[PDB]
Each structure stands twice: as C-alpha cells, then as structure tokens.
Amino acid sequence: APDSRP
Amino acid sequence: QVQLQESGGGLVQPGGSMKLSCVASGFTFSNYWMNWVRQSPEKGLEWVAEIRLKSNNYATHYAESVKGRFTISRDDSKSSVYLQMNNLRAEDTGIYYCTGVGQFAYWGQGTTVTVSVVTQESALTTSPGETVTLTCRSSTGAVTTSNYANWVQEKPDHLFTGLIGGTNNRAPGVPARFSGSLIGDKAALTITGAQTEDEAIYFCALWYSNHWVFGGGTKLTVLG
Ligand SMILES: *[C@H]1O[C@H](CO)[C@H](O)[C@H](O)[C@H]1NC(C)=O
C-alpha cells in the first residue's frame, strides 16, 4: 500500500 | 554508494518562506516515492509529506500540521524532490531529510531549518554478542503486515539509515544481524548478536492508509 517496490 | 543530498536550509523569521531541495544519485530515482521527514530539537521524527510517481500523477500527501503551508514536488529528469515551506513557525524548526526506498532505506545528511500513537521502549543496554529485541506497538489496535513497519537507525548524531521495511525485509547492504518481525500484535526488530557500532537510536514507523507515524525511538547503549 505504501511504496512496496524492492 | 547511493546518495541523497539536501540543501536550502538556514535561518528564517516566523511568517517566512523557504524551499528545500534534495538531489538523488546512484539509483533510479524516478521509480520510487519520496518523503520529507523532520527531526526537531526534542529529538524524535515526524513524517511531513510524500510524493508518488509519474504514473500516479505525482500524487502527494501531507501531515495535517503542514497541510496548506508546505508543498512537495519532484523533477525526475533532475533526480530531485522539493519542499516549499510558507508561513513557517517556531515549531517547524528542525532537521529536514528526504528519504525513501523500501520504505526509508535511504536518507540524506539533513538540512537544518531554524525559525527564530506508536510506542517504543525508551532505552535499552546491551553489549557485544548479546541479543536484544525492540518493539513497536500501535494504540489503534494490532500491528499487522498492512502497517508495513519500518525500522531506521540514527547513529551519533543525525546519521540515519533504513534497516528494515515491509515488516521483515532488510534493506540492501544492511547487516544480517538486524532482523524484523511481527510478534503477537507488535512489530519488532531483533539484533542477533549486537556489535559495538550499533549504539544508536532505533525508530520504527507504521503506515496507516495514507500517512506514516514514527515512534519515539529507542536509545540503544552498547557497553564494550
Ligand atoms: C506495493 O507498492 C508497489 C510500488 O509502488 C506497487 O504499487 C505494488 O502494487 C504495491 N502492492 C500493493 C498490494 O499495493
């Protein structure tokens, strides 16, 4: 939901 | 090394205006949301604003304390994020940082601005090779993976780096001794064999739909 990008 | 470098801070009179900048290098800036967070003389961190991606039309969210006085923006072809601050007041005094990535892996050095609930353990003492556990509790109810708990380390003095994001994901290059968890209804960070260099303040942050709340921070003393 927040920036979950690895 | 990744690098975020803030500028534009200084000394301002109440009622005044100031624009901060932050330039990113050494990674793909435009793939990540960015945030401003501010520390403040009482120690303690307060999230200020976020901005998302182009594909989100650069949507933004602000803490209520700054809503309508501050504006966050970004320029991807410049690798930059900005914080326009109007109507400053004494209580905006602090050190401001741009930070992002999974979800607070990277932090700038901070730029100082002088204008002139989440619960953690207060303090813990350890020594090298002991195991220590820090906890992060929510008054609103149970902490879950939907809160994307982060843990961030502040070394002496004002040097921040993200340790854990998404509850249990070590950020890249973080030493293996730092271990994130959900335990019962709390998030927790375990240092599995502390080292002398881990003396620092450890903050957690939880996500509540569209804003972050940072805890008060736990002061870790490491003897020996
Ligand atoms: C986690 O955030 C990423 C990157 O911004 C994507 O939006 C991904 O879809 C997210 N996952 C969920 C379930 O929201």
XYZ file of C-alpha atoms and ligand atoms in Angstrom:
244
model
C 0.000 0.000 0.000
C 2.920 2.420 0.513
C 5.856 2.155 -1.890
C 6.375 -1.641 -1.802
C 8.783 -1.567 -4.747
C 12.013 -3.549 -3.895
C 27.008 4.359 -2.605
C 23.529 5.713 -3.173
C 23.371 9.399 -2.236
C 20.628 11.851 -1.272
C 21.782 15.374 -0.543
C 19.515 18.079 0.789
C 20.013 21.803 0.561
C 18.348 25.140 1.117
C 18.031 25.158 4.898
C 19.142 28.014 7.119
C 17.658 30.712 9.348
C 14.176 32.167 8.856
C 11.882 34.517 10.754
C 8.426 33.363 11.778
C 5.987 34.075 8.891
C 8.824 33.410 6.467
C 9.215 31.100 3.476
C 11.898 28.576 2.428
C 12.311 25.955 -0.288
C 14.352 22.868 0.321
C 15.915 20.710 -2.296
C 17.109 17.125 -2.446
C 19.114 15.546 -5.260
C 19.322 11.771 -5.667
C 22.168 9.883 -7.206
C 23.374 6.359 -7.741
C 19.960 4.733 -8.218
C 16.816 5.036 -10.385
C 15.197 7.994 -8.615
C 12.002 8.098 -10.680
C 10.939 4.528 -9.704
C 10.388 5.378 -6.025
C 8.179 7.558 -3.893
C 9.901 10.169 -1.825
C 9.173 11.666 1.570
C 10.277 14.513 3.749
C 10.719 13.770 7.420
C 11.829 16.182 10.083
C 13.599 15.611 13.323
C 13.391 18.630 15.687
C 15.204 19.752 18.829
C 13.290 17.384 21.174
C 14.797 14.528 19.205
C 12.036 12.499 17.533
C 10.897 12.169 13.974
C 7.867 13.427 12.263
C 6.820 12.450 8.759
C 5.923 15.517 6.718
C 4.933 14.610 3.155
C 5.232 12.005 0.434
C 5.035 12.160 -3.327
C 4.485 9.249 -5.605
C 5.251 8.520 -9.230
C 4.522 9.958 -12.637
C 2.209 7.057 -13.184
C 0.326 8.244 -10.120
C 0.334 11.734 -11.469
C 2.749 12.644 -8.733
C 0.014 12.411 -6.027
C 1.012 13.832 -2.671
C 0.013 13.546 0.987
C 0.899 15.805 3.891
C 0.807 15.637 7.649
C -2.019 17.821 8.985
C 0.467 20.128 10.801
C 1.874 21.333 7.476
C -1.146 20.868 5.194
C -1.712 24.076 3.206
C 1.619 25.656 4.165
C 4.030 23.111 2.592
C 4.270 21.801 -0.971
C 6.230 18.721 -2.093
C 7.222 18.293 -5.705
C 9.733 16.422 -7.821
C 11.707 16.710 -11.037
C 12.679 13.294 -12.361
C 14.966 14.444 -15.160
C 16.830 16.280 -12.319
C 16.640 13.395 -9.803
C 15.210 15.970 -7.361
C 12.466 16.410 -4.792
C 11.444 19.683 -3.275
C 9.679 21.037 -0.203
C 8.298 24.533 -0.462
C 7.610 25.844 3.045
C 5.233 29.016 3.670
C 4.016 30.775 6.955
C 6.891 28.986 8.914
C 6.501 28.912 12.685
C 8.816 28.191 15.637
C 7.600 24.616 15.789
C 8.773 23.927 12.224
C 12.389 24.216 13.497
C 14.370 21.026 12.940
C 16.475 18.960 10.636
C 14.679 18.007 7.454
C 15.560 14.858 5.483
C 14.414 13.462 2.090
C 14.104 9.716 2.406
C 12.692 6.809 0.520
C 13.032 3.293 -0.898
C 11.611 0.196 0.778
C 10.360 2.352 2.507
C 13.012 4.519 4.334
C 16.312 2.625 3.155
C 17.939 5.933 2.217
C 18.254 9.255 3.941
C 20.056 12.500 3.140
C 22.505 14.181 5.510
C 19.706 16.516 6.620
C 19.369 20.299 6.127
C 18.754 22.465 9.257
C 15.841 24.896 9.405
C 15.738 27.284 12.299
C 12.716 29.529 12.651
C 13.562 32.258 15.181
C 0.310 6.627 18.741
C 3.312 4.459 18.194
C 5.109 3.259 21.317
C 8.714 2.017 21.669
C 10.909 1.115 24.624
C 12.622 4.214 25.958
C 16.104 2.796 26.454
C 17.990 -0.498 26.381
C 21.567 -1.503 27.304
C 23.401 -4.329 25.685
C 26.897 -5.495 24.918
C 28.558 -7.215 22.040
C 27.161 -10.678 21.334
C 24.001 -10.277 23.391
C 20.628 -10.468 21.572
C 18.207 -7.611 22.024
C 14.648 -7.076 20.937
C 12.932 -3.745 20.333
C 9.165 -3.446 19.926
C 6.779 -1.102 18.195
C 3.170 -1.079 19.387
C 0.056 0.685 17.982
C -2.640 2.219 20.211
C -5.165 1.929 17.480
C -5.081 -1.846 17.589
C -2.907 -4.647 16.357
C 0.147 -4.116 14.207
C -0.117 -6.176 11.016
C 1.685 -6.555 7.746
C -0.658 -3.867 6.408
C 1.267 -1.357 8.561
C 4.496 -2.021 6.576
C 6.623 -1.498 9.724
C 9.995 0.120 9.042
C 12.992 0.367 11.285
C 15.543 3.126 10.928
C 18.826 3.732 12.722
C 20.107 7.074 13.831
C 23.745 6.939 14.709
C 25.564 9.680 16.578
C 24.406 12.093 15.621
C 21.783 12.699 12.914
C 23.129 9.917 10.575
C 20.017 7.966 9.536
C 19.822 4.759 7.577
C 16.897 2.392 6.973
C 17.328 -1.157 8.316
C 14.028 -2.877 7.698
C 10.954 -2.200 5.537
C 7.722 -4.127 4.768
C 7.803 -5.650 8.256
C 10.612 -8.215 7.608
C 12.750 -7.102 4.643
C 16.307 -5.992 5.287
C 17.161 -3.063 3.001
C 20.122 -3.735 0.695
C 23.531 -3.941 2.331
C 22.085 -3.890 5.853
C 23.966 -6.289 8.067
C 22.412 -9.646 8.634
C 22.219 -9.236 12.427
C 19.202 -6.891 12.072
C 16.027 -8.970 11.856
C 12.458 -7.625 11.504
C 9.370 -9.372 12.779
C 5.684 -9.269 13.739
C 5.255 -10.775 17.205
C 1.761 -11.084 18.588
C 0.276 -7.653 17.943
C 3.548 -5.591 17.792
C 6.239 -5.142 15.165
C 9.767 -5.893 16.431
C 13.374 -5.555 15.483
C 15.950 -8.093 16.850
C 19.671 -7.582 16.781
C 21.010 -11.093 16.845
C 24.373 -10.558 18.399
C 24.913 -6.869 18.901
C 28.218 -5.151 17.824
C 29.869 -2.022 19.285
C 28.942 0.099 16.258
C 25.170 -0.496 16.902
C 24.957 2.138 19.609
C 22.264 4.410 18.155
C 18.613 5.406 18.435
C 16.253 2.941 16.623
C 12.950 4.327 15.349
C 10.003 2.433 13.968
C 7.372 3.713 11.606
C 3.997 2.355 10.752
C 1.726 3.003 7.811
C -1.937 3.967 8.343
C -3.669 4.043 4.926
C -2.060 7.240 3.674
C 0.440 8.554 6.251
C 3.309 7.321 8.378
C 3.630 7.627 12.096
C 7.085 7.339 13.673
C 7.566 6.093 17.169
C 9.520 7.935 19.792
C 12.726 5.939 19.217
C 14.595 3.554 21.475
C 18.006 4.561 22.709
C 20.449 1.577 22.458
C 23.627 1.731 24.535
C 26.160 -0.876 23.601
C 28.923 -1.412 26.652
C 32.282 -2.788 25.491
C 3.446 -2.116 -3.336
O 3.922 -0.880 -3.914
C 4.411 -1.101 -5.263
C 5.319 0.002 -5.828
O 4.814 1.335 -5.681
C 3.204 -1.392 -6.154
O 2.237 -0.334 -6.048
C 2.568 -2.682 -5.666
O 1.377 -2.963 -6.406
C 2.216 -2.478 -4.199
N 1.427 -3.629 -3.798
C 0.196 -3.433 -3.319
C -0.598 -4.642 -2.922
O -0.265 -2.316 -3.187
